[PDB]
C-alpha cells in the first residue's frame, strides 16, 4: 500500500505488477483507460531506464553533460562527436531524418498489435535469454521492472529540474558540489534564494 | 412597552438605527485616522 | 542543396512511407470514419448527384490498393517537406545559443 | 521603481503639489482675523494637509509623473498594505455579515410563519447570532467539509 | 459539577464532561457538530503541547541568562545567530521530517489504529491507545494516563497558549523579552504597566 491507513481504490486490487493503490486523481477508473495507462507507464519507464544511464555514463567520462552534448546542433556548422571522435554523418538534417524514419517505423510496428498482453510484454524475439518460463518468477520480474522504471522516471525528473535550477550543469556536477559541502549546498538555496 | 419594542424592531426602524450606528462608527474611525490610503501597521 | 536530389529523395521516401508503413493504418482509419453523411444517409444517397464518389479512378492494379489519389497525397507531402528543407537550409538563418 | 514610478518621498511633483495645496489654503487665511474661529478652522485644515502629505511620504507610496500616489496590486510584498491586507480585512468583514445573515435565515426557517420574523427582526435571536461572525472562517470551512454548506438535492 | 466558565450560565448540551478539561466554555458554538468537536479536541491537544514547549523554550533560557549561567540571545533575535548549517538547510530538513511525522499523526486521526505499526520493522507496534494519546514508545516512564492528569495537561496547555500570545504581543509593543518586562514591572509596579507602555 502506497499510504498505510488510506483505503485502496476498488479497481486496483494489488494483482497487477507494481500495484500499490496509488491513484488519488482516479484516472484509471475506466478499465479500458487503465489498460492504455499501464502500457504507457511501461513505455515511459523503459525509456527513462534506458536513458538515465545514458545521461550519466558519458558525463562520468571525459565528455560534457547531457545538455552540452546536444548543443552542437545549434551552430551553422554543427557536427557531432562520439567518444571523442567526429562522426561523419553528424550534420543535423541527416541525423534528424534517419531518426524520424527509424522511430516512426518501429513505433508503428509496435502499435500494430492487439493482444493486449503482448502489447506490454511482447516477448519472443525480445526475450532471447528466456526469463518468462516460470509464470510466478516472471511475475516478480515484472514487479522489479516496474519498480526500477518508476525509480528511473523519478530520477529523470530530478535531473531535468536540477538542470533548470542550475543551468549549464550536469547531475554528476550537482552531486559533486553537494558532496563538497553538504549542509550549505543543498536544495534550500534553490527553494529560498 | 412590548408593542413599542415590537414596532421598534420593524425593518425600517431597525435598518435606520443600524445604519446610523454604522455611519457614526465609520465617521469616528475616519476622524481619528483620516486620509488613510494604506494599511501601515503590518 | 541540389534541388532535384532533395526533392526526388524526399518524395520517394514519403511514397515509401505511405505505401509500406502507414498504409494499413490510413486504410483502417478511412474505413472506420466512412463517407460523410447527412441525416443518416450519405451525401449521394440524399439526392446530391455531384456527391457521388468517383469509383472509376479510385480503383488500381496495385496489390494492396495504392491508387492515384494517394500517390497525389503522399507526393504532395514529400514535396512540401522537401521544399521546407531546401528553403530552410538555404535561408542562412541562425539562432544564437 | 515598479512601473517606472518613483517614491513619493523623493518625488518632486509630489512636493510641488503639497506646496501648492498649502499655498491655496493659506491664501484664504490671511483675509480673516488672526485668531478668529474661521482662522482657527483654516489653520487646522492646513495642519491636516501637512500631516497627510508627510504620512503619504512616510508610508512609501509610489508617485507618477502626475505627482499623485499610485497603488500597486500585482501582489508585490512591498505594497501588501495597499490592497492585499485591506482585501483580507474586507473579506473577513463581508463574510461575517453574510454568515450572520445566513445563520439568521436558517434559524428562522422553521417557524409556521417565517416571513413575520423577516419584516419584524427578532432582535433577541439576532444579538446571539451576530457573534458567530467572529469565527465564521472556521464555521464555514467545517460547514463545507461536512458537506452541508450547499443544499444537496438541488 | 463539570466546571462552569460562567457560574450563572448553563453549559452547552453537546459538551457533557467526558472530555478532559470540559468546563462548558463555548459561547460561539464552534462544536455544534460531533465531528467538529472531535477534530478540535486534537487541534487543542497539539496546539497546547507546542505552545507549552515553545513558551518553555522562550522563557527558561531568558531567565537563565539573566541570572548568569548561559549566554543565549533573546527569542526574537535568535534567528540571526549563525549555526553550523545554513538557515534554509535547517528549514528544509525540518520540513521533510515534519511532513512525515505529521502525516503519520493525520492518518491516526482520520481512522484510529491504522498506523500503530512500525513501517520498517514489522514488530514493535504501539499499544492500542486513543487518538491524541499514543502511549507505548512515546511514554517511556509509563506514567499512568489517568483522567486527572489529562485535565492537568489540558489546563497547562491552555495557560501556555495564553502565555505565548502575551509573549508575542508584549515583544511587539515593548521591544524585549517577557522576563525583562516582568523584572521592570516588579521594580516599580505602579508606574510600569500597559498604560505607560502604550
Ligand atoms: C513555528 C513558529 C515560529 C514563529 C512564531 C516564529 C516567529 C518569528 N521568527 Mg522564525 N518563527 C517560527 C519558526 C521558525 N523560524 C525560523 C527561522 C527564522 C529566522 C532565520 C528568522 C526568524 C524570524 C522570526 C521573527 C519574524 C519577525 C516578527 O514577526 O517580528 C515581530 C518572529 C518573531 C526573523 C526575525 O527575527 O525577524 C526579526 C528571522 O530573521 N525565524 C525557522 C527555521 C530555522 C523556524 C522553524 O519553525
Ligand atoms: C484575552 C484572552 C482571553 C479571551 C477569552 C475570550 C472569550 C470570549 C469573549 C468574551 C467572553 C465573555 C462574554 C460575556 C459573558 C456572557 C457570554 C454568554 O455566555 O452569553 C450566552 C450566549 C449563549 O451561547 C449560546 O447561544 C446559542 C444561541 O442561543 C440563543 O442565542 C440568543 C442569546 O441571546 C437568543 O437567546 C436565541 O433565541 C438563542 O438561539 C446556543 O444555541 C446556546 O443558547 C448557547 O450555548 O453566549 C453568547 O454567544 C452571547 C454573545 C456573546 C458571545 C461572545 C463570544 C466571543 C465573540
Ligand atoms: C507517464 C508516466 C506514468 C504513467 C502513464 C503511469 C500510469 C499508471 N500508474 Mg504510475 N507512476 C509513475 C508514472 C506513471 N504512471 C511515476 C513516475 C511514479 C513514481 C512517482 C509512479 C508511481 C505509481 C504507483 C505507486 C502506482 C502507480 C500506478 C499507475 C496505474 C494507475 C494510476 C492511473 O490510472 O493513473 C494514470 C496516470 C497518468 C495518466 C499520468 C498522469 C500525468 C498527468 C497528466 C501529469 C502529471 C503531473 C506531474 C506531477 C508533473 C511533474 C513535473 C515535475 C516538474 C515535478 C497507471 C497504469 C498504480 C498501479 O496500480 O500501478 C499498476 C500505483 O499504485 N504509479
Ligand atoms: C534512448 C537512449 C539514448 C539516447 C537517445 C542517447 C543519445 C546520445 N548519446 Mg548515449 N548512451 C545511452 C543511451 C542513449 N544515448 C546508454 C544507455 C549509454 C550507456 C552505455 C550511453 C552512453 C553514451 C556515451 C559514452 C556517449 C553517448 C553519446 C550520445 C549522443 C551522441 C551519440 C552519437 O554520437 O551518435 C550515435 C552513436 C552510435 C549509433 C554508435 C546522443 C545525444 C555521446 C555523447 O555524449 O556526445 C558527446 C557519447 O560519448 N551515449
Ligand atoms: C529521485 C532521486 C533523487 C536524488 C538521489 C537526488 C539527489 C540530489 N539532489 Mg535532487 N531532485 C529530485 C530527485 C533526486 N535528487 C527530484 C524528483 C526533484 C524535483 C523536485 C529534485 C530537485 C532538486 C533540486 C532543485 C536540487 C536537487 C539537489 C540534489 C543534490 C543535493 C541536495 C538534495 O538532495 O536536495 C534535495 C532533493 C529533493 C528534495 C528531491 C526529493 C527527494 C528525493 C525523491 C529523495 C543531490 C545529490 C540540489 C543540488 O543540485 O545540489 C546543489 C538542488 O538544488 N534536487
Ligand atoms: C468601491 C468604492 C470605494 C472604495 C473602495 C473607497 C475607499 C476608500 N475611501 Mg471612499 N467613497 C466612495 C467609494 C469608495 N471609497 C464613494 C462612492 C464616496 C461618496 C460618498 C466616497 C467618499 C469618501 C470620502 C469623503 C472619504 C473616503 C475615504 C476612503 C478611504 C478611507 C479608508 C478608511 O476609511 O479608513 C479605514 C477604515 C477602517 C479600517 C474601518 C474598518 C475597521 C472595522 C470597523 C474594525 C474591524 C476590527 C477587526 C478608502 C481607501 C476617506 C479618505 O481619506 O480617502 C483617502 C475619505 O475621506 N471616501
Ligand atoms: C487552538 C486553540 C484551541 C482549540 C483548538 C480549542 C478547542 C476546544 N476547546 Mg479550548 N481553550 C483554549 C484554546 C483552544 N481550545 C485556550 C487558549 C483556553 C484558555 C482561555 C481554552 C479554554 C477552554 C475551556 C474552559 C473549554 C474549552 C473547550 C474546548 C472544546 C470545546 C469548544 C470548541 O470546540 O470550540 C472550538 C475552539 C476553537 C476552534 C479554537 C479557535 C480559536 C480562535 C478561532 C482564535 C481566537 C483568537 C484569539 C482571541 C487571539 C474544543 C475541542 C471546552 C471543552 O469542552 O473542553 C474540552 C471547555 O469548557 N477551551
Ligand atoms: C484555501 C482555499 C481553498 C480551500 C479548499 C477547501 C477544501 C476543498 C475540498 C473539500 C471539499 C469537500 O469535501 O466537499 C465536497 C463538496 C460536498 O462535500 C461532501 O459532501 C458529501 C455528502 O454530504 C460528503 O459529506 C463528503 O464528506 C463531503 O466532502 O462537493 C463539492 O464541492 C464537489 C467537489 C468534489 C467532491
Ligand atoms: C502553538 C503556539 C506556540 C508555539 C510556539 C513555538 C513553537 C515557539 C517556538 C520558538 O520560541 C522558541 C521555542 C525559540 C525561539 O527563539 C524561536 C521560536 C520559533 C519563536 C501557541 C498557540 C496559541 C494559541 C492561542 C493563544 C489560542 C487561543 C484561543 C482562544 C482564546 C479561544 C477561545 C475560544 O475558542 C474557545 C476555546 C471557545 C470558542 O467557542 C470561543 C473562543 C473565545 C473563540
Ligand atoms: C510504376 C511502378 C513503380 C514506380 C513508379 C514511380 C516511381 C512513379 C511516380 C510518381 C511520383 C513520384 C509521383 C509524385 C508526386 C505527386 C504529386 C501530385 C505531387 C505534388 C506536390 C505539390 C503539388 C507541391 C506544391 C508546392 C507549391 C506549388 C507551393 C510551394 C511548394 C510546394 C511544394 C508546397 C515501381 C517500379 C516502383 C513499382 C511498380 C509500380
Ligand atoms: C490573489 C490575488 C489576485 C488574484 C486572485 C485570483 C484570480 C484567484 C481566485 C479565485 C477563485 C477562482 C475563487 C473562487 C470561488 C469559487 C467558489 C465556488 C466559491 C464560493 C464561496 C461561497 C459559496 C461562499 C458562501 C458564503 C460565505 C462563506 C460568505 C457568507 C455566507 C455565504 C453562504 C454567502 C490578484 C492578482 C487579482 C491581486 C492580488 C490578490
Curated annotation (Swiss-Prot), chain A:
One GO CC term on file: chloroplast thylakoid
Binding residues for chlorophyll a 2: 44
Sequence positions that bind chlorophyll b 3: 107
Residues engaged in binding chlorophyll b 1: 2
Principal place of residence: plastid
Binding site for chlorophyll a 3: 83, 145
Keyword match Ribonucleoprotein: no
Keywords assigned by UniProt, alphabetized: Chlorophyll, Chloroplast, Chromophore, Magnesium, Membrane, Metal-binding, Phosphoprotein, Photosynthesis, Photosystem I, Plastid, Thylakoid, Transit peptide, Transmembrane, Transmembrane helix
Subunit structure: The LHC complex consists of chlorophyll a-b binding proteins. Red-emitting heterodimer with LHCA4. Interacts with LHCA5.
UniProt name for this protein: Chlorophyll a-b binding protein 6, chloroplastic
Organism encoding this protein: Arabidopsis thaliana
Part of the full-length chain shown: 47 to 239 of 241
UniProtKB/Swiss-Prot annotation, chain E:
Entry annotated with the keyword Transit peptide: yes
Residues engaged in binding chlorophyll a 5: 152, 170
Topological category with respect to the lipid bilayer: Multi-pass membrane protein
Main location group: plastid
Annotated binding of chlorophyll b 1, by residue: 5
Amino-acid positions noted as binding chlorophyll a 4 in the UniProt annotation, renumbered to this chain: 156
Residues reported in the UniProt entry to bind chlorophyll a 3: 153
Binding residues for chlorophyll b 4: 105
UniProt record, GO biological process: photosynthesis, light harvesting
Binding-site positions, chlorophyll a 1: 25, 44, 158
Post-translational modification note: Photoregulated by reversible phosphorylation of its threonine residues.
Transmembrane segments: 50-70, 83-103
Subcellular location: Plastid, Chloroplast thylakoid membrane
This protein's GO CC annotations: chloroplast thylakoid membrane; photosystem I; photosystem II
Binding site for chlorophyll b 2: 49, 92
Molecular function via GO: chlorophyll binding; metal ion binding
Binding site for chlorophyll a 6: 185
Residues binding chlorophyll b 3: 86, 102
Subunit (UniProt): The LHC complex consists of chlorophyll a-b binding proteins.
Free-text comment about domains: The N-terminus of the protein extends into the stroma where it is involved with adhesion of granal membranes and post-translational modifications; both are believed to mediate the distribution of excitation energy between photosystems I and II.
Family statement drawn from the similarity comment of this UniProt entry: Belongs to the light-harvesting chlorophyll a/b-binding (LHC) protein family.
Function field: The light-harvesting complex (LHC) functions as a light receptor, it captures and delivers excitation energy to photosystems with which it is closely associated. May channel protons produced in the catalytic Mn center of water oxidation into the thylakoid lumen.
Protein name stated in the entry: Chlorophyll a-b binding protein P4, chloroplastic
Organism in which the protein naturally occurs: Pisum sativum
Name of encoding gene: lhcA-P4
Shown residues within the full chain: 52 to 249 of 252
